[PDB]
Amino acid sequence: GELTDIQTFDTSYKINADTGEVTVVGDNSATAGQYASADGAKVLVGSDGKL
């Protein structure tokens, strides 16, 4: 019954197995950047949130 080519996100369905977003951590500061299409947007951990 498992859809091989169809996955479900935390919200709905999509054909992506994993988002796999990449976050780069600044060495000189505790700030962690966003290494993706957002391209450096600051990442923060929310209440009961992964990132």
Binding site for a copy of itself (CB under 8 A): 26-30
Q: How far is the CB of 30 from a copy of itself (least distance, A)?
A: 5
Separation in Å, CA 17 to CA 3, 14, 20, 34, 41? 11, 8, 9, 20, 24
Q: How far is the CB of 38 from a copy of itself (least distance, A)?
A: 22
Element (H, E) at 47: none
Q: How far is the CB of 31 from a copy of itself (least distance, A)?
A: 8
Contact by Cβ (8 Å): 25, 32: yes
- Residue 1 or 46 with smaller CB distance to a copy of itself: 46
